[PDB]
């Protein structure tokens, strides 16, 4: 079936996009940590 | 059906966008980490 090949296909893509979103959200949290470290260091070193 | 034909390329188009965005974001994150390494040297 072509209909089944397209849906298996959609499910895979949706899953991968959701995984990317989770990954990127975690990166954003990590980035906030990096930015805080940079700010602290910049005032420490002047 | 055609609602899923649309849903499919919508999903695949978005996926390719994630790949492009990710490599851009990784250059950005490496830059922040490099800046921290430099600041720690002081």
């Amino acid at each position: 079936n072509n209909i089944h090949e397209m849906e298996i296909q959609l499910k895979d893509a949706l899953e991968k996009n959701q995984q990317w979103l989770v990954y990127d959200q975690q990166r954003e949290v990590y980035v906030k940590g990096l930015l805080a470290k940079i700010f602290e260091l910049e005032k420490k070193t002047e | 059906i055609h609602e899923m034909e649309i849903q499919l390329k919508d999903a695949l188009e978005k996926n390719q966008q994630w790949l492009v965005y990710d490599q851009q974001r990784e250059v950005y994150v490496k830059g922040l980490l490099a800046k921290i390494f430099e600041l720690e040297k002081k």
Binding site: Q19, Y23 | L12
Partner: peptide, 13 residues
């Protein structure tokens, strides 16, 4: 053709 992230969790999270 569709690809997911390098890891399921972002390194450092």
């Amino acid at each position: 053709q569709a690809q997911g992230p390098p890891y399921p969790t972002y390194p450092g999270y």
